[PDB]
Amino acid sequence: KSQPGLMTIRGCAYAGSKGVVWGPIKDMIHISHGPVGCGQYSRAGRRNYYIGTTGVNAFVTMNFTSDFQEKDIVFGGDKKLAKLIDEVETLFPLNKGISVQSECPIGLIGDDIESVSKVKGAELSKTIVPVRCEGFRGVSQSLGHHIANDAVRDWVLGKRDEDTTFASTPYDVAIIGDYNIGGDAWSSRILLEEMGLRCVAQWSGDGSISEIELTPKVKLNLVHCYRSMNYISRHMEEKYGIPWMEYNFFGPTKTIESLRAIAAKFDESIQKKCEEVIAKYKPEWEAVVAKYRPRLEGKRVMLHVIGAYEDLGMEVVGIKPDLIGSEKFIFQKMGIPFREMHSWDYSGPYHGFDGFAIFARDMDMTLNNPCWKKLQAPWE
Amino acid sequence: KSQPGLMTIRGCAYAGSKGVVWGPIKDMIHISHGPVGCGQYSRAGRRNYYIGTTGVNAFVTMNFTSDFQEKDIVFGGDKKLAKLIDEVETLFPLNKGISVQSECPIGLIGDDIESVSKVKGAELSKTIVPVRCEGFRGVSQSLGHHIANDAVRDWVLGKRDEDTTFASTPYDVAIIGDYNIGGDAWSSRILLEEMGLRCVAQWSGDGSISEIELTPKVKLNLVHCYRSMNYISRHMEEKYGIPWMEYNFFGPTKTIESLRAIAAKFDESIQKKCEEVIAKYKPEWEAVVAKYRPRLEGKRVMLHVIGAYEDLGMEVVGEEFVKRIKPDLIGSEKFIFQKMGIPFREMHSWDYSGPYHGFDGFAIFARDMDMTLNNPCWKKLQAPWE
Amino acid sequence: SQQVDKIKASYPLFLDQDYKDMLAKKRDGFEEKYPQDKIDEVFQWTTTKEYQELNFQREALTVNPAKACQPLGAVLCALGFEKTMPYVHGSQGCVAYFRSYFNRHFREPVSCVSDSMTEDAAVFGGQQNMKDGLQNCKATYKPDMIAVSTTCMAEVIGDDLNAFINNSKKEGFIPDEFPVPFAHTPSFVGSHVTGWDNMFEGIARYFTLKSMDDKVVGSNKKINIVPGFETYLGNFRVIKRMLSEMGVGYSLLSDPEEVLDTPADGQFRMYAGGTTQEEMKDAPNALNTVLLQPWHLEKTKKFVEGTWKHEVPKLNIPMGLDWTDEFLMKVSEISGQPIPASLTKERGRLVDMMTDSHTWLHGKRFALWGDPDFVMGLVKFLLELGCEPVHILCHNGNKRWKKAVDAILAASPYGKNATVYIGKDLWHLRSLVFTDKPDFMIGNSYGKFIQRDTLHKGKEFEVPLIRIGFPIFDRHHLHRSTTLGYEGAMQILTTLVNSILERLDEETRGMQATDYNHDLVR
Amino acid sequence: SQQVDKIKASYPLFLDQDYKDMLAKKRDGFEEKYPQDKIDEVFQWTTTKEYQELNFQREALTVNPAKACQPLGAVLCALGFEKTMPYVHGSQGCVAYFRSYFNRHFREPVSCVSDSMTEDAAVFGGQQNMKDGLQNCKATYKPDMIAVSTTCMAEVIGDDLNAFINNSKKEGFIPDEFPVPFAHTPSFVGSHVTGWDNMFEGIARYFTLKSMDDKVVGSNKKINIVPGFETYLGNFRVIKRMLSEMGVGYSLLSDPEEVLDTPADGQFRMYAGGTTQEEMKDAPNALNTVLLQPWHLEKTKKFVEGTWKHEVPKLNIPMGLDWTDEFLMKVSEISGQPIPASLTKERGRLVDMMTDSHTWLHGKRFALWGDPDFVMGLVKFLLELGCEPVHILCHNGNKRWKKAVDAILAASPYGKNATVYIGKDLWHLRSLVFTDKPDFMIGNSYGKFIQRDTLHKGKEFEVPLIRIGFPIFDRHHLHRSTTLGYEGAMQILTTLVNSILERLDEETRGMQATDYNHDLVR
Numbered sequence A: 001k002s003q004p005g006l007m008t009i010r011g012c013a014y015a016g017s018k019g020v021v022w023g024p025i026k027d028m029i030h031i032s033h034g035p036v037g038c039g040q041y042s043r044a045g046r047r048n049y050y051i052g053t054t055g056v057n058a059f060v061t062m063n064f065t066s067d068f069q070e071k072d073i074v075f076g077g078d079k080k081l082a083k084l085i086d087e088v089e090t091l092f093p094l095n096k097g098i099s100v101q102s103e104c105p106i107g108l109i110g111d112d113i114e115s116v117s118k119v120k121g122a123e124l125s126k127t128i129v130p131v132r133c134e135g136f137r138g139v140s141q142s143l144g145h146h147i148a149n150d151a152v153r154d155w156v157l158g159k160r161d162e163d164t165t166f167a168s169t170p171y172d173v174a175i176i177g178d179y180n181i182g183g184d185a186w187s188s189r190i191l192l193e194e195m196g197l198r199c200v201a202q203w204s205g206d207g208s209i210s211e212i213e214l215t216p217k218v219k220l221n222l223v224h225c226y227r228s229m230n231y232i233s234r235h236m237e238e239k240y241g242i243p244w245m246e247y248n249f250f251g252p253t254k255t256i257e258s259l260r261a262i263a264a265k266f267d268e269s270i271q272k273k274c275e276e277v278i279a280k281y282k283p284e285w286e287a288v289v290a291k292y293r294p295r296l297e298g299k300r301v302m303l304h305v306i307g308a309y310e311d312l313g314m315e316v317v318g319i320k321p322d323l324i325g326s327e328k329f330i331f332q333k334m335g336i337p338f339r340e341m342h343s344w345d346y347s348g349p350y351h352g353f354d355g356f357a358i359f360a361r362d363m364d365m366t367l368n369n370p371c372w373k374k375l376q377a378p379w380e
Numbered sequence B: 001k002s003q004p005g006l007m008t009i010r011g012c013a014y015a016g017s018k019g020v021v022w023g024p025i026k027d028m029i030h031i032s033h034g035p036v037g038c039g040q041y042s043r044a045g046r047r048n049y050y051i052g053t054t055g056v057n058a059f060v061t062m063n064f065t066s067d068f069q070e071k072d073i074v075f076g077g078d079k080k081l082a083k084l085i086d087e088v089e090t091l092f093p094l095n096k097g098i099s100v101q102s103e104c105p106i107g108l109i110g111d112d113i114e115s116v117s118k119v120k121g122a123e124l125s126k127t128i129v130p131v132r133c134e135g136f137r138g139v140s141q142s143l144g145h146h147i148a149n150d151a152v153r154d155w156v157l158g159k160r161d162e163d164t165t166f167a168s169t170p171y172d173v174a175i176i177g178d179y180n181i182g183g184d185a186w187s188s189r190i191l192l193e194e195m196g197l198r199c200v201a202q203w204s205g206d207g208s209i210s211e212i213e214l215t216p217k218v219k220l221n222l223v224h225c226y227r228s229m230n231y232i233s234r235h236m237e238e239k240y241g242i243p244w245m246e247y248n249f250f251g252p253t254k255t256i257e258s259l260r261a262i263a264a265k266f267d268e269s270i271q272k273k274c275e276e277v278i279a280k281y282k283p284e285w286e287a288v289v290a291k292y293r294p295r296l297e298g299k300r301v302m303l304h305v306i307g308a309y310e311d312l313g314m315e316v317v318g319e320e321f322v323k324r325i326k327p328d329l330i331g332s333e334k335f336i337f338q339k340m341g342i343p344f345r346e347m348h349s350w351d352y353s354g355p356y357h358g359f360d361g362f363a364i365f366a367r368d369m370d371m372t373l374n375n376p377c378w379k380k381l382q383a384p385w386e
Numbered sequence C, D: 001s002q003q004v005d006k007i008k009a010s011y012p013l014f015l016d017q018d019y020k021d022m023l024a025k026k027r028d029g030f031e032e033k034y035p036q037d038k039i040d041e042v043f044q045w046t047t048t049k050e051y052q053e054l055n056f057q058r059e060a061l062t063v064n065p066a067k068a069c070q071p072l073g074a075v076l077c078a079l080g081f082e083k084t085m086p087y088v089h090g091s092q093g094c095v096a097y098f099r100s101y102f103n104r105h106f107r108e109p110v111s112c113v114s115d116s117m118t119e120d121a122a123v124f125g126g127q128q129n130m131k132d133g134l135q136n137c138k139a140t141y142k143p144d145m146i147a148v149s150t151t152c153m154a155e156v157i158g159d160d161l162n163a164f165i166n167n168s169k170k171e172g173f174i175p176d177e178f179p180v181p182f183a184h185t186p187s188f189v190g191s192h193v194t195g196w197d198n199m200f201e202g203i204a205r206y207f208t209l210k211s212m213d214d215k216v217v218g219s220n221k222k223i224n225i226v227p228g229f230e231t232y233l234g235n236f237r238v239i240k241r242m243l244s245e246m247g248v249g250y251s252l253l254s255d256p257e258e259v260l261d262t263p264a265d266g267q268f269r270m271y272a273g274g275t276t277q278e279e280m281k282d283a284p285n286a287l288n289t290v291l292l293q294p295w296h297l298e299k300t301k302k303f304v305e306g307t308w309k310h311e312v313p314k315l316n317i318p319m320g321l322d323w324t325d326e327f328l329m330k331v332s333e334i335s336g337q338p339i340p341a342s343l344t345k346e347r348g349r350l351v352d353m354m355t356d357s358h359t360w361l362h363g364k365r366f367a368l369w370g371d372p373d374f375v376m377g378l379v380k381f382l383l384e385l386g387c388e389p390v391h392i393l394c395h396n397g398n399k400r401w402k403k404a405v406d407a408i409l410a411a412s413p414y415g416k417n418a419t420v421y422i423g424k425d426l427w428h429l430r431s432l433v434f435t436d437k438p439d440f441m442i443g444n445s446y447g448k449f450i451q452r453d454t455l456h457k458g459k460e461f462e463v464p465l466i467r468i469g470f471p472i473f474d475r476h477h478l479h480r481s482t483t484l485g486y487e488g489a490m491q492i493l494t495t496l497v498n499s500i501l502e503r504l505d506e507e508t509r510g511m512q513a514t515d516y517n518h519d520l521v522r
């Protein structure tokens, strides 16, 4: 689907699976199965915020790899994978599960990670998830998302099907597909909790394996990133009868609309609490608008994303752009600021009422910075 | 007197008085009276270590100055000095006294700091010590030491002459003339306390005005720097009948000899405790010697100070002199000698390290000597192609 | 909640009471977290000698490696040539990662393409991918040359680069005369530095192997300089400056300094500077070839000695004082140019700085890691400063390199407490700095996590990181620094001594507790 | 109390239990210290707005000044001339302090003599001192020229430098032809920079006033550069480098970079480099004279415009981006040389670094201090970076300079919360950073005490110091840095952004507390 020999930042299936879906799960150890490159380049590369003690009970920013050498390629890496799992158990005893994310060579040398995963999982009474996420599969990270979701469904999601000990409430929701970039999911979750809902599950961002296992016990599935987690959402809608819906917390308008839509799916008490939360946060985002819209009104951003921009008086186009929203360094060299709706490189959160202030400040900072006005030497 | 135009390093009377004697006192505010230069260059320039909350109850590293302008030179600075004292009282209420260290112009424009000091001290019930330490007086810091000691005697030392409320013991000593360079005085004091004595007074290093006032109540005056404090020491001997003696805590040999000499001035209990202290520290300084003497044995230092060098097996040998005598350490113009490729370290850790005195200081001294003398930087002066 | 006048970013926004309460509820209700006492116990255990013994017994698991894969080095090498497009035959994910890694280190655009080999190519091979990719790349980006490397997919399926490129040329996809040097860069062999070596040898071979008949050694009166895998722009600059200052004719080969440092003047420059094809073709005519980083330029050295017939000198990396002296002396000998007064003065100034700072530098204990040549140069310089390196780690090092470093350590009294580790990762190093604590670490940004861990044990156990090496992601513009020559030695010395002094200031900043040693003069 | 294997210096030796107990006994028994609760109350009070009002009402007391006295600047100016011995007519203590101050900043030998005026000279004047001193200095140190300044004693007594030097020449103490320029440098007027200006004007007058008949403006096709009081060797070097790049003939009058940076090669060099007497004598023949630091070169400017008849361009200090551009354009205009491509590229690279770092730099609040030209340049650069200066302190500034800086601040949206203070010391600044806390301080080493104070109030109230300016005593080799031009802008930007990132790393290093924001990539 991608033209050979053209520049693109498009990722692989491994990036979509390990980097996006599995990697943010804090209490599981994710093994980049194969040669050293992929895990090293992906290590701590995405700002999927979590709370934990890294290297003891949480492992997100660490790079675990089998570090394939030539002998592993020639003779296979299944024995190495079993020994690696044993070593992981010895050195990281508080891990609550292991994922094995296949890199390219795993799919080509005929390694059977499924059998090793099953055997070692049975032996150690631990969840070991084999993910066939080899980079050459598909054309983009999208197939990686699909493969990772299938792994979630097959190995983790159904773990508590026969368990009925979890006390459920009618206001139980799961946030799915929020990767907690700069704490975005946290900024969303507080609003949901202030509305009276109980966020039983939140993954992958700041996600635990128990939360994934508890997801089929919730009343509603709020999906942030539909593209990557629609597969699991549909599966849960069929198997468990759990409704799912999309929510957009980017900017006050989208946040208010999404909160009202979510509350409309519950009783009157939740709707009343929703109105109270909106009323509480109204002066804060109004103050943010009052401060930053005069500095940003009329600026053209070229392209979820749209809401905050219109809330700040900005104009969205699809050019003469002041900002590009839809590779950053090329545009920067060309003299146009580049910024996604998520605050991936250094900032955030951007979602929710708290994130709106940060987003507005960053927009004003980037667009009105004098660095963009100094490209032309005064003698040229 | 210094020969004019010959690039010496000698300081002035202000450096001797403000920098050395008065400046280390911690609970007093010292005003560098005059133009801005002297206080700025002397600010925190000597490592006279102290314990306190700087700017609240301690003021050693701060620079207080009258910052003389042209108007002050032409019309005098007595009114400015009185106003300054008022401002000091307002902004630093926990100061326990003020000294006024005169810079050069003070002695030349006919300012009367004594009258201002007396009036403001009477008004505020505060000890204000006028020091006429103008830099042009004398030929070196030595006269500054003399002037500062006279000021101490005249304004602070006799404050508790009629007071008899201080409970005195037969083992009362005062550490006089230790400026606590890198904590040297503290390293000395701990030994004296372990010997059974109590150091009632220790000044100026980590010194308080109350300790100076309590000095006439001690049984013995242990003087470290004889040159700078012999005047006050003889005064207290003549007036209060307090004997004084010099002590040398540089290296294990000098430290042991000094400790025994000091203990010999007291009863049998102090001598026994002295023997106990010596016995306790013997394995430590012996271990230091065992480690560092092989790395330093035979090295020649050029030019009190002698003891530690000999304890480390170094020999003190004392322009073409340096090329003839070929010293390893100058040990006596630091950057000039360093450019000539010879290390220059004194017996006090003036620049960056220490303490050097006492048993604890001997380890630091030995490590620093080995570090500087045996550093490979000294062996890289000649380019291999030259 | 946010206040419009003091907007808080993630830190410290999430330290607010409402966020803390929310996170506590999440953890207690749904995360099934281990008790804090258990976590504390396990952490303390991970900081122990018994744990270190278990950690060092690892045979299958690698945690926090200190190396990358070959094609990254191949891309860096290719970027150093004029109007050259790095081309990686294989999967697109690799190229995305390579570009991101270099963008984050250099904070510049990085050019690289892939031919997007997918499952079809996984079955049938990537010949069609090569033809289409070469055609599209040439048509779109108009490079003067395409340098081809490989991802692990292409290497495992056994794509024949030579045959594929020849078939592309033969079938009219690219002009026959268009330069397409290639190198096999298997990610499961060696490291990124190996990729650099392989790529350089491939380009040199492409431009010189078949035209050696008319070459005469030393007929152009120049010295070839092969930098190897280098991520400090200052190193290229300083080598060029020192050679020009000496009046020595030189040709830097794989010069990427211009392309990685384009000005921001409102236009995007895909290409800038670089070694020209004529320089590569004329390289065999040089007096000699000097390899700046010989420990990962073995294949290049074999080719240059065997084909160009250059008597490649035995020079260490020109790092520190002694090795810079040796490099300059060897260059003088080869070129016949005397070492100028300016370089002698610069050396004397470095020695002066060493003398000024030796009191603070002497006896300081360092754990360090990085690439073999960089690491051995850093160790040598530390020994020259009287510092003692204690934990020397080189994940991509070998036994011969370890023997060399051990010999260097044995020659110095400051190497008595030093151990060299090869094949060990940063988890091993974390254990080492817990059990045998050094004063500082020297390494890339990944060491920041180790510092974090040490601080968790206690402030007295914290090991501060000094960021020298590759990659540096959490600081800006350190890639512009220098590590080679006298200038690089001065920069490193300044960094080290001021890191020591900053740490001392931090630990003596406590009012009425430790500030007695908070000296104005240091 | 020492272990021979791990010997501890004062810190942390005195933290041992026995030392702690001894210090407690000393304090409790004899120091008559105020209770700790009283000390805490007074400290907290000193951090308040009420204390700030009382502090700012000071009119007679100066606490922690941010300036020195004239003869220090006179000495620095004199050191910039070839084989010139700085000579201060007055008391020896002054020269001891000057030499120590410069040694501590530069970590180099600093040559300066005094004629040791004592109480004898206090009544009869210092004529005999001048005669003997000049004779002895010439005989001993063999200088090519003796530059004479004065201490406050000589100025108060009213020593006539001109008459004394003429009498020394008349009575055979020095040769009549031997150059002995002089300047009155009263320490109670202005500051050290004023001393530099006075000394320079005295030397220029000595060499040019009586030989203006044969001078033609612009006959030597050169531009005079007067750096002023400058303590960064990189500034001299960068100005020379930039002017050489443009192919502009220049004469840097008072160049001390060589004498302050002699190599360590086993030989002591009293003199090195410096502006030659021939350059000073030929200076009126230059096309024009550029004053790098015009706000403390007023007397020099008057002399150069009135006597040499040079149309001195109205230039700010070449600091930051706009002012460097203006400086280069003015040099181009005067010399007729176009700005070369190399300088354009360097400017573009500075702009690139600004663009890369603007997200971290924007909105940061700074309290800064130093000399007028340096301070205004730093303020302009901070405004160009989008940073917000809040507390601008210049102890030796004047009302005209303050008006200028206020005009600069008013022209920028980032100068709205900025106030300029002249005649205020570092105690004022301590109050300011307590009551209106900035993110960082930029200043010399004395600001470390302020940071200490702020840390005592609490970690959240700590204001870290960034060491730019003079003097820097507690860090090594920062005197080699650059602050002028594009290179100086790059160095300053790097320092600022990495200080911000370093502080953020420290604040986010807490495991399971703040480390969620301990990002690898920044």
Ligand code: ICS
Residues within 6 Å of the ligand: A016, A020, A141, A142, A145, A179, A225, A226, A227, A228
């Ligand atoms: S998963 Fe997808 S490329 Fe939906 S592969 Fe990519 S963290 Fe993008 S536009 Mo990186 S389909 Fe997420 C994405 Fe969007 S990694 Fe993130 S930003 S919302």
Ligand code: ICS
Residues within 6 Å of the ligand: B016, B020, B141, B179, B225, B226, B227, B228, B348, B350
């Ligand atoms: S006071 Fe004197 S010059 Fe006795 S003015 Fe000087 S802190 Fe020296 S040899 Mo600096 S008579 Fe003390 C001295 Fe000795 S300042 Fe220190 S080291 S033991």
Ligand code: CLF
Residues within 6 Å of the ligand: A012, A013, A014, A015, A035, A036, A037, A038, A039, A041, A102, A103, A104, A133, A134, A135, A136, C069, C070, C071, C091, C092, C093, C094, C095, C097, C150, C151, C152, C153, C187, C188
């Ligand atoms: S598309 Fe994706 S990132 Fe690429 S390899 Fe494949 S799973 Fe991995 Fe890995 S070690 Fe280096 S970076 Fe590759 S060449 Fe192999």
Ligand code: CLF
Residues within 6 Å of the ligand: B012, B013, B014, B015, B035, B036, B037, B038, B039, B102, B103, B104, B133, B134, B135, B136, D069, D070, D071, D091, D092, D093, D094, D095, D097, D150, D151, D152, D153, D187
């Ligand atoms: S010998 Fe001593 S240090 Fe000299 S002045 Fe006199 S008391 Fe003082 Fe002061 S302000 Fe500057 S440094 Fe002088 S010229 Fe005056």
Ligand SMILES: [Fe+3]
Residues within 6 Å of the ligand: C106, C107, C108, D352, D353, D356
């Ligand atoms: Fe950049």
Ligand SMILES: [Fe+3]
Residues within 6 Å of the ligand: C352, C353, C356, D106, D107, D108
């Ligand atoms: Fe030096």
